[PDB]
RNA sequence: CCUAUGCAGCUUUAGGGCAGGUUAUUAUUCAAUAAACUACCUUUUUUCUGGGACGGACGCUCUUAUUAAAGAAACAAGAGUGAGCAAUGGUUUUUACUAAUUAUAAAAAAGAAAAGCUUAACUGCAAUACAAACAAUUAAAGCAGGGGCAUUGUCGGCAAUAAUGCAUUGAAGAAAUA
């Protein structure tokens, strides 16, 4: 995701998701996903420091 | 040998010590690249002898 | 600073437009992370020099405002963009940067709102709890 | 300067050699050392030094 | 050690020079057991020269 | 292509702060983030003149505070240090004794302060702890330099804190709101013109009141540095608050803890508050001040060397090493030092009884070497007390002595 | 160099001893690492532009050309 | 009309560039690169000459007139040349031979041809002269080393007089430093 220029993001799931994964794992989801689908419906928040240690 | 510190020291000794500074150190050893150009390492204040 | 200058003037005739009219656009826009950068020419024939201006590529999306629980259009660089998803979010940039770093009217207009509500809200919510 | 548009100065090849750096060094001749020792400069009784 | 190997190529091939001196001497020698224009009596002992000598050095090479 | 190409992209970096120099605010942040950084006087009446209708009580109160460091000292009372630069409590210079502000700057400061303190009134009653601090700490600035004669606001300002018991700083109070309340009011009561008798009344009774129910029967000292200390011992000296100890041992007990932090020009201060207060028990905090000189030398002032010495004859407390290190120093600086403050020094060096060889020297070489000498009454016997209880003998110390009388004699007011 | 030749470069301040300039790098004890720049090759080819090159080579000199705009 | 350290405007398949548009390729949710087309920017386009243009010419040798020392010019005249040879180079022996070159009264202890052996068509230096504005160009006794043919002489290319190109930049073999 360093790498990856904006377009991979780490993402902290709240709830279960049908593919992306269970709630408290930590994984690489597509930008545009996130910004559209995962985190205005409130499923997810970004992997900062202070939300993995909250909520991961 | 002598560096650029040391032959300071050598010439002129009153610069440091009417400041009450500490003489220059002397080298340890010089480069291999210069070996056949040296015999000894110089030091700061030079021992005299009599001849 | 004093070096920025020198290169300024040295701007094609044409390119020395089109860099004044790149800057007008900072107050209607989100600068974020906006640089400058000069492209320079030079040939192995001659000793000849070319400067000219290289364009910013400005992207409309709408990012996810939870505070305010709407998506706000905005027009970002690329690189600002990938800086708001790293930090956290467009409410994360706004709480987290000072309005001195901001460097735009729209945003500092955007980041004046959304901390006056959330102050409004937490005291709400500490007040009941 | 200018010859006229011959330029004959510049049809010479160029050397690239580097001398050597003990020409930086201060050279004394040993006659002009013991000239000093005779007149009564320096003491030869005793080891000399640079200083 | 770039000296010990380029000083030991020299001297392996000073000591081959002298065959290599014998063989080109050699080729350039007219060996009258394979001339057949002696029997036709016709053609110079030069152009003889040449006509056997440039054979030999050019299958050679 | 023939003739082969290079490109090179170059990138022009810009600070990451903005400065609010030319354009104009259009929000609440905006406005005081302009106000906050202005640099010049000429800034600040612009933002009012123009925005005046868009201000708040927090507008107000940042301009206020803001202004005191607007107004420059002249550049004939200062002295520029060598190769010092800004940092933590170090400045790039040192102040000449009542130095005095800039010929030019005075009527634009005086004209916007009156501006704003008629505005001020109506938000008098939504001030916090935080902002009456920084307020009075800005009119004692003000008051220091001559821009203002007394605080209009002063007896709200007082009234607000005494309050319900201190109540506003029980909740929201922090360690520079004690160093800013004690030292401003310091600065009104003493700098410029002396004072008036009602308003001395009223500062020293709320400094007491203040100091024994906040610091001491609340331990609030806790939030103190040594900074921080030594500013309120230094306000307490200059008000004589000499009745109560048991702060002082307090204050005195942070500055030790701390003193690495202080620099010649805190220590000094220290020194001298303490030399005013009489309180010369604690040899064991003079000892541990005297061993910060050692190092932070060359950031040493005549000022600074002045009030050691002073301060060490007063409290009696006799460190050769320190004594060593402000005579080399001043013998050095003589050419800074004023006729009337190289005689106090001169006395200072014989009240202690100590005989230092390369300052009298020093002295006595250049007081030869004057032709035509005028010493004045006012100092003639300090220098001749000096010379007595130093123990200068005949060497050239009589000749010195000699010049002075004579000089002396010839005027004979 | 021939007479004529020589007394010009002479009466215009010519004194070079060697080829090239000595470097104080290479004498033992004085070598300061902040000081280093490796060994470039001379440069042998005159600066003959009429417009900004020597003025020993030119017979006169010519107007600067235009900048590009 | 001709001559300039000339100037300007215009034209094009004279040189270079990409900085608008179109087009091509690639990338992010108004962008980057360009041997293309259009537009634009910048630069170059000798001299001699019975005035200039048109035509012709520009290096290096031989010969003719200006007598029998040398030298000597014109858009004067009559001819060559921008190489060749592994022997047509070096050196010994023999003799019913004494030519040829672009041109030419060279040469008999000399050459040419024939027969044999060879690589001096070398390494490192060089007194003294011819010529010459300078740069370079020309002849050369002699000294040391390793060789060739002779057996104590010669060989540092070719009967001689033309067969050429500074410095810079680039490349190869070897050696010394760092
Ligand atoms: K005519
Ligand atoms: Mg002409
Ligand atoms: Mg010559
Ligand atoms: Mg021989
Ligand atoms: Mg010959």
């Known amino acids: 995701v360093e790498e990856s220029n904006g377009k991979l993001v780490k993402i902290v799931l709240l709830d279960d998701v049908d593919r992306v994964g269970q709630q408290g794992q930590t994984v690489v989801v597509k930008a545009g996903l996130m910004r559209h689908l995962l985190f205005p419906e409130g499923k997810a928040l970004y992997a900062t420091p202070e939300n993995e240690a909250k909520y991961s | 040998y002598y560096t650029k510190d040391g032959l300071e020291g050598l010439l002129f000794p009153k610069r440091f010590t009417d400041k009450n500074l500490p003489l220059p150190r002397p080298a340890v050893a010089w480069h291999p690249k210069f070996d056949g150009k040296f015999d000894a390492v110089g030091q700061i204040p030079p021992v005299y002898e009599a001849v | 600073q004093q070096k920025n200058v020198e290169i300024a003037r040295k701007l094609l005739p044409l390119a020395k437009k089109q860099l004044k009219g790149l800057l007008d656009r900072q107050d209607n826009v989100l600068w974020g992370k906006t640089d400058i950068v000069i492209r320079k020419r030079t040939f192995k024939k001659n000793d000849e020099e070319l400067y000219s201006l290289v364009q910013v590529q400005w992207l409309d999306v709408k990012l996810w405002s939870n505070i305010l629980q709407e998506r706000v259009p905005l027009t970002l660089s690329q690189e600002t963009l990938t800086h708001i998803e790293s930090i956290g979010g467009l409410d994360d940039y706004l709480l987290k940067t000072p309005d001195s770093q901001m460097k735009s009217n729209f945003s500092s207009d955007l980041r004046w709102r959304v901390v006056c509500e959330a102050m409004k809200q937490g005291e709400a919510e500490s007040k009941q709890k | ?51 | 050690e770039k000296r010990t190997k380029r000083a030991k190529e020299i001297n392996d091939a000073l000591a081959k020079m002298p065959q290599l001196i014998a063989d080109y001497k050699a080729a350039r020698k007219i060996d009258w057991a394979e001339v057949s224009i002696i029997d036709k009596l016709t053609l110079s002992k030069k152009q003889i020269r040449e006509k056997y000598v440039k054979r030999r050095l050019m299958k050679q090479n | 292509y023939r003739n082969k190409v290079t490109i090179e992209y170059i990138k022009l970096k810009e600070p990451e702060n903005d400065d609010y120099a030319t354009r104009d605010p259009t929000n609440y942040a905006q406005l005081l983030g302009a106000i906050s950084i202005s640099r010049h006087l000429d800034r600040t009446t612009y933002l009012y003149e123009t925005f005046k209708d868009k201000f708040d009580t927090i507008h107000y109160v940042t301009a206020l505070t803001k202004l005191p460091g607007l107004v420059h000292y002249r550049g004939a009372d200062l002295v520029m240090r060598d190769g010092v630069q800004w940092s933590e409590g170090v400045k790039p210079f040192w102040q000449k004794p009542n130095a005095q502000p800039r010929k030019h700057l005075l009527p634009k400061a005086q004209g916007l302060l009156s501006k704003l303190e008629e505005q001020f009134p109506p938000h008098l009653n939504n001030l916090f702890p935080r902002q009456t601090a920084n307020l009075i700490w800005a009119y004692g600035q003000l008051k220091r330099k001559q821009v203002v004669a007394a605080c209009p606001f002063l007896g709200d300002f007082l009234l607000s804190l005494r309050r319900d018991n201190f109540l506003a700083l029980d909740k929201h109070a922090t360690g520079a709101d004690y160093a800013q309340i004690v030292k401003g009011l310091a600065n009104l009561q003493t700098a410029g013109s002396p004072a008036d008798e009602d308003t001395r009344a009223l500062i020293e009774d709320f400094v007491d009141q203040l100091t024994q129910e906040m610091l001491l029967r609340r331990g609030h000292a806790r939030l103190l540095d040594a900074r921080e200390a030594q500013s309120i011992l230094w306000g307490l000296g200059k008000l004589n608050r000499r009745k109560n100890t048991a702060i002082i041992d307090v204050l005195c007990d942070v500055v030790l803890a701390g003193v690495n932090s202080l620099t010649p020009t805190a220590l000094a201060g220290a020194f001298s508050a303490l030399a005013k207060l009489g309180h010369s028990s604690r040899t064991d905090v003079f000892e541990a001040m005297a061993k910060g000189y050692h190092l932070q030398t060359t950031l040493m002032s005549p000022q600074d060397v002045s009030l050691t010495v002073c301060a060490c004859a007063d409290l009696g407390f006799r460190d050769d090493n320190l004594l060593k290190i402000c005579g080399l120093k001043a013998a050095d600086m003589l050419g800074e030092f004023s006729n009337a403050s190289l005689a106090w020094l001169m006395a200072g060096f014989g009240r202690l009884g100590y005989n230092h060889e390369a300052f009298f020297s020093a002295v006595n070489k250049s007081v030869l070497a004057e032709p035509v000498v005028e010493v004045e009454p006012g100092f003639a016997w300090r220098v001749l007390s000096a010379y007595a209880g130093s123990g200068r003998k005949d060497s050239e110390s009589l000749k010195v002595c000699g010049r002075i009388t004579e000089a002396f004699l010839a005027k004979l007011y | 160099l021939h007479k004529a030749y020589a007394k010009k470069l002479l009466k215009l301040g010519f004194k070079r001893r060697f080829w090239t300039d000595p470097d104080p790098q290479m004498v033992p004890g004085f070598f300061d690492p902040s000081k280093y720049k490796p060994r470039e090759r001379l440069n042998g080819k005159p600066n003959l532009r009429p417009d900004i090159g020597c003025p020993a080579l030119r017979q006169s000199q010519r107007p600067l050309k235009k900048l590009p705009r």
């Open chain 4, 1 to 51: 300067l200018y010859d006229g548009g011959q330029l004959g100065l510049v049809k010479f090849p160029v050397t690239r050699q580097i001398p050597s750096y003990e020409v930086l060094y201060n050279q004394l001749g040993v006659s002009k050392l013991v000239e000093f020792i005779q007149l009564g400069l320096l003491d030869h009784t005793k080891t000399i030094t640079m200083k």
